């Protein structure tokens, strides 16, 4: 009978969860070792442990069919069993799983091993993306130098892994279908537990898109004045290499040349950080201080003992794209970041420490619940703090921003600077997964794969390669997440919902009142707020124990993902910018790019 | 898997 079975099932889950945590710890350790120190030996070790865990998961998924779990009374037990049926890549036959893992490490290690030659010195060929190439892309205003580094990087990080990427798509699709999803797109989307999730995002993106187009138009206008019309056209897509970022995903590095009021203050605390002798250690300690100030959890000793917070100085290869790691025991959580002393990096630190906080908050949950309410929730946590960290209010408090007068013009500068990060990124984030979804779904013929990438980047972001590309090139894997098979929709979700969290935390902190000119949303600091911390504790402690609308409700009483809060934040910018574009007769929109030959 | 910046 079912009553006796459900009692037995509860006991089964309790034991299995603990076993899965312990086994995942072993896999995670091998993965950590590889990412910290890329060698053939560590690759082999990483992949063989995973093959072993995959085999164990196969038996787990099989064993779930012996339980009448869909018949149970307990929603909680049913939810746990459903999680256990989700094999993902582990559904693949033994040999196919091994080949997929070999394919994934080939791509990630290619990306991590990219070195290019100095633009001025063709014999100095040890320049890595992090930090050498990214430093040029962010600081250089020599358009030909920028174009050189763009071409060198994309050729090496993208084109070199076309064959591997093709095999990856094949095996991703096979895995998805073995789980009875149509493709890897539906597999990814399953994480959001909502059959209208794509439409919901389209609707929100459509509401914010006009604001993006104003920002795009104004930026293009200002770039024309800086570089001249031979480099930037009025009516064409923006050459992406001028936007201060290798993927043009965020444009804040060119704020000094595109800011609304060049004679009024523009926040850039990097120089002050260096002057005051800031170190990566100090930056992480400050992040820790922020969380504890909100009555949230202090970083445990294991974090300080085991983390890598600086790029190693030996000869070794490693992945420098920052990462936060949960080892599924108690208090064993780590970051690996190749930390630099900059304002932008200060944000990355808080962003990554948001993951660590999430790990600690839900570590008491059953193994299957020890993850985010949805992938977007995990990415949002640290960004809510970074929003506060970025305010003139907070930066003055900590002594990094000096002699700042917050008049109307400085406010517009700060709003525009934030938008160069937060609004600009939305079409970018959407295209990363629209591209991969279309490949997963079999909607693009292999002969059209590269220009299908650039077509999306054009349609949505209005940017283009600095040079003519073709199907001889393969540019998508030049983005880390694409080489490393990390879903990107999480970030689109995050950038929307982080404003819902931020607005609510700010209200709870007494830091925001729409009817009070002294408390604007764009100058809210939640540092020290126990009330904001209480909301985070309520939501984060839940892990994945309930569907994500329940986790949002626990934070602020709402159940719906909404673009209202992000629009509210930027409304004063929208009003000013619409008027400023009209004032300057700024052309809005772009013609179809000529930069990918079919 | 590890959680990473955009
Ligand atoms: C993705 O979708 C796939 C379908 O597209 C799906 O694959 C199906 O899974 C079924 C298992 O759930 C499986 O069904 C079994 O079929 C056996 C015979 O099938 C053979 O002949 C077919 C041709 O006619 C071939 O195509 C197959 O390849 C097979 O060779 C049956 O013998 C078997 O039965 C037994 O099991 C049921 C148990 O069912 C439940 O359990 C309790 C038991 O206490 C019942 O009380 C309860 O009511 C419930 O029915 C018993 O009822 C029965 O007595 C037998 O013991 C079973 O029906 C099917 O073959 C398989 N393929 C296809 C093509 O249908 C995948 O599972 C999906 N994958 C994922 C990850 O979800
Ligand atoms: C800094 C460091 O840990 N380097 C190690 C190296 O000494 C070792 O020989 C190799 C094994 O593949 O793994 C890596
Ligand atoms: C000032 C304040 O609110 N402090 C809270 C306390 O009330 C709560 O019991 C504790 C447990 O998480 O967290 C902290
Ligand atoms: Zn992240």
Residue numbers in the entry:
A (entry chain A): 17 to 614
B (entry chain P): 6 to 11
Question: Can you quote the paper on this entry?
Answer:
BPPb is one of several blood-pressure-lowering peptides isolated from the venom of Bothrops jararaca and has been shown to be an inhibitor of D. melanogaster AnCE and both domains of human somatic ACE, but with > 200-fold selectivity towards the C-domain. For the inhibitory BPPb peptide (pGlu–Gly–Leu–Pro–Pro–Arg–Pro–Lys–Ile–Pro–Pro; Ki, 107 μm) clear continuous electron density was observed for residues Arg–Pro–Lys–Ile–Pro–Pro. The structure of the AnCE–BPPb complex revealed interactions between the pyrrolidine ring of the two Pro residues in the penultimate and C-terminal positions (P1′ and P2′, respectively) and the amino acid side chains that form the S1′ and S2′ enzyme subsites, respectively. The two Pro residues (P1′ and P2′) are strongly anchored in the prime binding sites (S1′ and S2′) by hydrogen bonding with multiple residues. The Ile residue from the BPPb peptide forms a direct coordination with the catalytic zinc ion by replacing the usual water molecule observed in the native AnCE structure 18. This residue is further stabilized by interaction with the hydroxyl group of Tyr507. The main chain of the next Lys residue of the peptide in the P2 position interacts with Ala340 through two hydrogen bonds. Of the two visible N-terminal residues of BPPb, namely Pro and Arg, Pro is stabilized by hydrophobic interaction with a bulky Trp341 residue, whereas the Arg side chain forms a weak interaction with AnCE via a water-mediated hydrogen bond with Asp501.
Peptidyl dipeptidase A is a highly glycosylated ectoenzyme that cleaves dipeptides from the C-terminus of a broad range of oligopeptides. AnCE is a single-domain glycosylated protein that closely shares enzymatic properties with human ACE (in particular the C-domain of human somatic ACE) and is inhibited by classic inhibitors of the human enzymes 14–17. In this study, we elucidate how the natural peptides Ang II (the principal end-product of the renin-angiotensin–aldosterone system), Arg–Pro–Pro (the BK-derived peptide) and bradykinin-potentiating peptide-b (BPPb, a snake venom inhibitor) bind to the active site of AnCE, revealing novel interactions involving several enzyme subsites. Comparison of the four structures clearly shows a common mode of peptide binding to AnCE.
